[PDB]
Design a binder for this molecule. Structure first.
Ligand SMILES: *[C@@H]1O[C@H](CO)[C@@H](O[C@@H]2O[C@H](CO)[C@@H](O[C@@H]3O[C@H](CO[C@H]4O[C@H](CO)[C@@H](O)[C@H](O)[C@@H]4O)[C@@H](O)[C@H](O)[C@@H]3O)[C@H](O)[C@H]2NC(C)=O)[C@H](O)[C@H]1NC(C)=O
Ligand SMILES: *[C@@H]1O[C@H](CO)[C@@H](O[C@@H]2O[C@H](CO)[C@@H](O[C@@H]3O[C@H](CO)[C@@H](O)[C@H](O)[C@@H]3O)[C@H](O)[C@H]2NC(C)=O)[C@H](O)[C@H]1NC(C)=O
Ligand SMILES: *[C@@H]1O[C@H](CO)[C@@H](O[C@@H]2O[C@H](CO)[C@@H](O[C@@H]3O[C@H](CO)[C@@H](O)[C@H](O)[C@@H]3O)[C@H](O)[C@H]2NC(C)=O)[C@H](O)[C@H]1NC(C)=O
Ligand SMILES: *[C@@H]1O[C@H](CO)[C@@H](O[C@@H]2O[C@H](CO)[C@@H](O)[C@H](O)[C@H]2NC(C)=O)[C@H](O)[C@H]1NC(C)=O
Ligand SMILES: *[C@@H]1O[C@H](CO)[C@@H](O[C@@H]2O[C@H](CO)[C@@H](O)[C@H](O)[C@H]2NC(C)=O)[C@H](O)[C@H]1NC(C)=O
Ligand SMILES: *[C@@H]1O[C@H](CO)[C@@H](O[C@@H]2O[C@H](CO)[C@@H](O)[C@H](O)[C@H]2NC(C)=O)[C@H](O)[C@H]1NC(C)=O
Ligand SMILES: *[C@@H]1O[C@H](CO)[C@@H](O[C@@H]2O[C@H](CO)[C@@H](O)[C@H](O)[C@H]2NC(C)=O)[C@H](O)[C@H]1NC(C)=O
Lengths: 216, 75, 226, 48
């Protein structure tokens, strides 16, 4: 969704605190301002991305304490308040699997990871307790089994199939969630799409810094 | 009037303990705005809290509707 | 009622556009970015890049042919890298604008010329229809959407157990106002009596988790007895 | 940015409603989805 909001300052990077170098640099016109402007544009866009992806719910919903969802078991994905942060179990597994001073700065994101966790908790509680109706206007509660009957009716399987197979379907869903949990805990290749982003940014900065050591 | 934020030292703005929508983002959750008149810096707010009254035998059905018109602008 | 609500919504759009100018930031930002890029490109000409003077006729008029090439080479390299920087950034920005042009064409084809079920594609709500409008270097869509308004609590039940057989709604949902059971469409409280024309039968009452007892009146029996 | 736009589309059309676009939300007939955060990205669980 978003890269790292890096920024640079041309004068410090090129002519480190050197008056003679900074007087020579002025003959290249507006090269400095142009680069700073481009990097600031990227930096702002990076927060626009997160805002657009996550901030799609008007109000922060919450799940009731009495979790009786007709058989399904969401405790793996819902928030765990015992933990300091609000991150759920699978969110923690995801976070635990993803891993100078030349003018380079790393600005911080506008939405902190805790606030992002609050957004996703809102979305998850909303879908669980109100189907798809929180998407359009107000959120109208509906029993989860009836929501799933609506969903089956949505794909050409009549309602009675769900109700007559409710316990079986609940068990299959729970086991599938368990298998996702085990897959993420065991293997580490799944998160390549994010690790490639982090690696590419780190390599770009390492090349940028190593370039200061060249004679030219 | 000197606030320490996870993004730097903000001098000139009065820290408050409320939380409103963001007006001028600073970083790491803090946002600043011109209100009661001085510049304040407050933790961002994600929206009004809500808690759907879920129960296994209760449903809510609309009895009325509105027709809305929204505008979307695209270059 | 629907006609009046639609007309009022259009009027409010007109008033909002008349009052609030910042509505078209998306287009104004593109115009500003292009003007800014050209402004910097032009301003680059007043830079020496190391030569004796940033104007080329002074170099040509002051210095001998065998010596002019050093100053002119400095100016040419500087201006050439400036022009390449401009062109590259324009190419990237044009790619972004083409992405928006493809998105706008898709919205027009799917949302104007038809009705789309893709959620939140055309405005926050169930989508009804859209109207295009031009704008300077862009397009404005007016999305007309249906938003449910006033909700009432009702007690529900997945199925109705009558005569031993379990009845499910043909299309709709069972609701009760406290003492009687009715079947309604899911998006507007319009309650109907539970008949054998609103429900279908499947199995018996021992499998469904939450079935409730009631009667399913049959339209055929009174007419057949009469 | 292109990935972020695809993620926003998926969240709107998959988390907030059922989708009939084939293979937009995982192989099979789509039922529902659940978002989860991740460092610099989002992870969807697609129930089909
Ligand atoms: C669904 O919501 C609609 C609005 O979102 C409701 O429509 C409104 O219903 C009532 C009566 O139709 C009116 O709302 C108020 O009415 C009072 C008194 O009505 C008198 O004055 C109005 C305005 O001159 C006039 O139109 C009436 O005929 C009466 O002479 C007004 O004093 C209020 O200002 C307010 O308008 C509206 O007339 C009407 N709105 C529209 C746009 O027609 C509708 O009733 C709701 N549905 C249900 C089932 O409750
Ligand atoms: C839930 O909905 C039912 C269905 O409308 C309501 O039952 C109906 O209530 C009205 C008013 O109490 C009854 O009218 C009364 O009954 C007599 C004889 O039918 C009628 O001639 C009079 O006009 C009298 O006002 C109506 O009969 C009754 N329907 C049936 C089939 O008995 C019920 O009141 C609703 N409950 C709640 C809590 O809203
Ligand atoms: C919907 O209606 C049916 C039938 O009207 C209800 O089934 C009835 O359930 C009760 C309690 O489980 C049964 O009572 C039992 O009676 C036998 C003698 O017949 C007695 O030996 C037991 O100790 C018990 O008292 C009743 O027989 C049974 N009716 C039948 C089988 O025809 C059903 O409970 C109703 N739904 C709900 C939610 O109550
Ligand atoms: C819902 O799923 C949870 C997640 O596994 C289960 O509760 C766990 O059950 C196992 C087996 O006893 C133990 O790890 C703990 O008892 C529970 N986990 C934790 C972290 O406490 C169970 O399948 C379901 N729980 C409920 C309450 O229905
Ligand atoms: C809001 O402003 C500051 C927060 O920076 C509060 O100061 C502390 O607030 C915590 C929790 O609100 C208290 O436990 C501390 O005792 C406060 N510090 C002191 C020295 O008392 C301040 O109290 C808050 N005020 C209001 C009105 O919310
Ligand atoms: C349906 O009923 C429920 C409970 O009777 C309503 O939810 C409660 O509303 C009161 C205020 O009216 C709050 O004080 C409670 O906290 C609510 N309950 C919960 C669990 O939050 C609900 O408002 C009713 N639905 C409608 C449309 O009025
Ligand atoms: C819906 O939830 C309610 C509340 O938990 C259930 O009511 C319980 O029912 C069991 C057995 O029927 C009783 O032992 C409990 O004492 C009841 N609790 C309350 C608070 O009423 C109800 O059973 C659930 N619906 C279904 C179909 O099981």
């Amino acid at each position: 969704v978003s890269m790292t909001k890096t920024s640079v300052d041309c004068t410090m990077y090129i002519c480190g605190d050197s008056t003679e170098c900074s007087n020579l640099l002025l003959q290249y016109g507006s090269f400095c301002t142009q680069l700073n402007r481009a990097l600031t544009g990227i930096a702002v866009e990076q927060d626009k991305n997160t805002q657009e992806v996550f901030a799609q719910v008007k109000q922060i919903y919450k799940t009731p304490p009495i979790k009786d969802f007709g058989g399904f078991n969401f405790s793996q994905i819902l928030p765990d308040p015992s933990k300091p942060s609000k991150r759920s179990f699978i969110e923690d597994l995801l976070f635990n699997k993803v891993t100078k001073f030349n003018g380079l700065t790393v600005l911080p994101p506008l939405l902190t990871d805790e606030m992002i966790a609050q957004y996703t908790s809102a979305l998850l509680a909303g879908t669980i307790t109100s189907g798809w109706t929180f998407g359009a206007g107000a959120a109208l509660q509906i029993p989860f089994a009836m929501q799933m009957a609506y969903r089956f009716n949505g794909i050409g399987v009549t309602q009675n199939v769900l109700y007559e197979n409710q316990k079986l379907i609940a068990n299959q869903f729970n086991s599938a969630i368990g298998k996702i949990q085990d897959s993420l805990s065991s293997t580490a290749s799944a998160l390549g799409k994010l690790q490639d982003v982090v690696n590419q940014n780190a390599q770009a900065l390492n090349t940028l810094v190593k370039q200061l050591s060249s004679n030219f | 009037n000197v606030f320490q934020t996870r993004a730097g030292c903000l001098i000139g703005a009065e820290h408050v303990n409320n939380s409103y929508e963001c007006d001028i983002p600073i970083g790491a959750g803090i946002c600043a705005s011109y209100q009661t008149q001085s510049i304040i810096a407050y933790t961002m707010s994600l929206g009004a809290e809500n808690s759907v009254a879920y129960s296994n035998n209760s449903i809510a059905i609309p009895t009325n509707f509105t027709i809305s018109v929204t505008t979307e602008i695209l270059p | 009622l629907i006609a009046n609500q639609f007309n009022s919504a259009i009027g409010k759009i007109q008033d909002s556009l008349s009052s609030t100018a910042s509505a078209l930031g998306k287009l104004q930002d593109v115009v500003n970015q292009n003007a800014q890029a050209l402004n910097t490109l032009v301003k680059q000409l007043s830079s020496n890049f190391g030569a004796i003077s940033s104007v080329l006729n002074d170099i040509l008029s002051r210095l001998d042919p065998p010596e002019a090439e050093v100053q002119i080479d400095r100016l040419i390299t500087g201006r050439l890298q400036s022009l390449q920087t401009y062109v590259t950034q324009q190419l990237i920005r044009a790619a972004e604008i083409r992405a928006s042009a493809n998105l706008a064409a898709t919205k027009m084809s799917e949302c104007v010329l038809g009705q789309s079920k893709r959620v939140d594609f055309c405005g926050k709500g169930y989508h009804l229809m859209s109207f295009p409008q031009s704008a300077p270097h862009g397009v404005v869509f007016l999305h007309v959407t249906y938003v449910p308004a006033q909700e009432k609590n009702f007690t529900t039940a997945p199925a109705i157990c009558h005569d031993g057989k379990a009845h499910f709604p043909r299309e709709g949902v069972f609701v009760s106002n406290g003492t009687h059971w009715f079947v309604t469409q899911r998006n507007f409280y319009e309650p109907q009596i539970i008949t054998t024309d609103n429900t279908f039968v499947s199995g018996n009452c021992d499998v469904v988790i939450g079935i409730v007892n009631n009667t399913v009146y049959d339209p055929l029996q009174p007419e057949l007895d009469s």
